[PDB]
Amino acid sequence: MARVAIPSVGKDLSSMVSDRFARAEYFIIYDTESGNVEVVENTIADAHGTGPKVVQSLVSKGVEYLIASNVGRNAFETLKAAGVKVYRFEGGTVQEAIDAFSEGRLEELTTFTREG
Template sequence: MIVTQKIVIPVEDQNGLDSKVASHFGKAPYFASIDLNGRGQIIETKIDPNTGEHLGGTGHPHENLLALKPTVIIACAMGPGGLHSFQNAGIMVLKAHGSTVSEVIANFKEGKLTPLTGGCPHAHEHHHTH
């Protein structure tokens, strides 16, 4: 089966398609990676831990996820660094609509998701060192 779409969604838990969508991309404990075939059927779902510096790891989550070669990122909110990084890499970034991965994927397949624009407007409780 040929993968035609790889969708990455930040999630709160490791419950596969029933995983709860995280409210903020960079602080999500996990990322769901969903592969779709040309007919929009799910052929693989994986949940991987967020190894970014926001959660004590290294690097920025968006930089770490580029290695997965996603075609679409779906999130409720995202900082401007992640948003611009994905957009510059030609990856579509959409606003999540739904509380679980399966709901978000259904809305994606039905064309109900809109582009995520402008990074998250809130102040972060952390500091980056550059």
């Protein structure tokens, strides 16, 4: 059992999932013990900075997982620093990231490319 986070852009369970962990706007933390959810509101819409902050918060709510197709930048190392299993997602609202993951139709995203 764990906490998966999901990069949303709003505070309902059929809001759109963002194509970017560290450029999401909300993080939906599904507690796989009592079907409970928390909506974090994390106003990360740029790159650079010092410290995770995004990661620091989610991590400090035990999050050992994530459903995120890609990242902004400056977070992926601090994810795995807290054993955070980052999945891919591709095209869905917050529930789809779960329904997809839970019934094994998502990918483990344990590296990715960036020509930037």
